[PDB]
Amino acid sequence: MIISEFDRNNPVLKDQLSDLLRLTWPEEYGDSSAEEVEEMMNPERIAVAAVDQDELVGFIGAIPQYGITGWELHPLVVESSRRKNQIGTRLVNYLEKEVASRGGITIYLGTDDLDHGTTLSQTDLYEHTFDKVASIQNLREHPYEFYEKLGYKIVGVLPNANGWDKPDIWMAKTIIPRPDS
Numbered sequence: 001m002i003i004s005e006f007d008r009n010n011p012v013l014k015d016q017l018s019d020l021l022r023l024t025w026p027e028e029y030g031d032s033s034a035e036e037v038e039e040m041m042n043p044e045r046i047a048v049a050a051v052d053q054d055e056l057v058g059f060i061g062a063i064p065q066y067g068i069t070g071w072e073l074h075p076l077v078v079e080s081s082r083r084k085n086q087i088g089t090r091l092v093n094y095l096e097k098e099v100a101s102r103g104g105i106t107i108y109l110g111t112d113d114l115d116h117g118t119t120l121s122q123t124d125l126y127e128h129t130f131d132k133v134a135s136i137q138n139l140r141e142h143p144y145e146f147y148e149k150l151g152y153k154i155v156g157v158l159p160n161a162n163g164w165d166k167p168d169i170w171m172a173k174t175i176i177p178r179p180d181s
């Protein structure tokens with residue numbers, strides 16, 4: 001397989017992406033799936049594909065939310081039969097260089113804990129907020145640990161976002177060398 005920039009003019013790659021998003025997050029992607037993928041094709045954003053044979057085995061994107069300095073990692077999906085084989089790691093690393101070249105300094109993302117897959121859920125997050133964030137533990141293979149192993153740190157939490165004790169975990173990473181103090 002090869003990871004490279006997404007052919008934004010390939011109708012098949014786009015359909016494959018639409019299918020991948022609908023099979024992974026059907027609650028977020030539905031009938032207007034094609035229109036949502038077209039938004040991911042916007043010139044200002046970055047679109048990186050992981051392709052093997054005739055399949056889109058993975059995809060990653062980033063939106064410039066704060067000028068060209070603050071990018072959001074959205075989305076990131078690997079085919080179910082292709083996970084835990086480093087595609088995600090290679091895709092995130094590829095995105096980081098894409099962002100850096102465009103003047104980006106940091107990439108952030110938000111990953112919710114809806115299935116009680118982290119110790120940050122089912123607990124009053126306003127109580128010892130940051131002591132809890134620090135002592136976090138993965139209970140159900142929650143993707144937060146993935147980003148953590150890639151250098152992203154939990155920089156914030158949104159308590160009770162998806163209902164009682166179901167927070168949104170905010171993670172970020174500065175991709176370029178700090179100009180010192």
Ligand SMILES: CC(=O)SCCNC(=O)CCNC(=O)[C@H](O)C(C)(C)COP(=O)(O)OP(=O)(O)OC[C@H]1O[C@@H](n2cnc3c(N)ncnc32)[C@H](O)[C@@H]1OP(=O)(O)O
Pocket residue numbers: 024073074075076077078079082083084085086087088089090109110111138140141142143144145146149
């Ligand atoms: C931006 C958003 O929408 S949030 C992103 C959430 N994405 C999803 O849940 C979609 C479905 N999942 C996937 O696409 C993938 O499993 C990803 C993107 C979460 C990870 O990609 P993969 O290629 O499967 O993981 P990769 O092989 O790079 O794993 C790298 C390391 O992180 C670990 N890791 C990967 N996924 C997870 C996870 N869900 N939970 C815990 N650890 C994980 C791996 O075990 C490995 O650790 P090791 O080096 O100690 O062995």
